[PDB]
C-alpha cells in the first residue's frame, strides 16, 4: 500500500518551489547557528 504514499511523497517534492524552500531553510539554520 506504500506505493500511493511514495507517489504522494513525489507529488509534494517535485518542482522548483520545494528545493528553493529547502535552500532558504538551510540558510536560516546556518545563520541561526552562526549568529554567535
Amino acid at each position: 500500500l506504500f506505493k500511493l504514499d511514495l507517489e504522494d511523497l513525489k507529488q509534494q517534492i517535485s518542482g522548483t518551489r520545494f528545493i528553493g524552500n529547502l535552500s532558504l531553510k538551510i540558510r536560516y539554520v546556518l545563520w541561526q547557528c552562526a549568529i554567535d
Binding site: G20, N21, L24, R27, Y28, W31, I35, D36
Partner: protein, 115 residues
C-alpha cells in the same frame, strides 16, 4: 500604518530595556530571521519583517546581506531574466507591493553603506 507603528514600538523597547540585551536582541532577530526566510507567507508579514530589520542596526543588517539574493530569486522569480520586461513579468504579488518591497529593502540597506 500598523506595521510602521509596531515596528517603531519594537525599537522603543530595544532601548527602554538595555539591561536585557543579549536576551531580546538575538531572540527578536531570530524571530525575524525565522519568519522572513520562507516563500509561503503573505506580503504584509514580509513587510513587517523588513521593517523590523530596519529598526535594528549595524552588522545584524549586514547579517541579512548574504541570504537576500536567494530570497529575491525565490520570491520574485527571476528565472534567467535579463532585467528588461520587469514591469509586466511577475507571480505571487501585484506590481504595487513588489515596488513597496524593492523600496523597503533598500530603505534599510542605506544604513550599512552610510558608515
Amino acid at each position: 500604518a500598523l506595521r510602521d507603528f509596531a515596528a517603531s514600538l519594537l525599537d522603543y523597547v530595544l532601548k527602554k530595556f538595555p539591561q536585557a540585551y543579549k536576551s531580546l536582541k538575538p531572540r527578536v532577530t531570530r524571530t525575524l530571521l525565522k519568519t522572513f526566510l520562507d516563500i509561503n507567507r503573505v506580503f504584509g508579514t514580509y513587510y513587517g519583517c523588513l521593517k523590523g530589520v530596519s529598526v535594528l542596526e549595524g552588522e545584524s543588517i549586514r547579517f541579512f546581506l548574504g541570504n537576500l539574493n536567494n530570497w529575491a530569486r525565490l520570491v520574485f522569480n527571476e528565472s534567467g531574466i535579463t532585467l528588461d520586461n520587469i514591469e509586466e513579468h511577475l507571480t505571487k504579488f501585484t506590481k504595487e507591493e513588489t515596488q513597496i518591497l524593492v523600496d523597503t529593502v533598500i530603505s534599510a540597506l542605506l544604513v550599512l553603506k552610510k558608515d
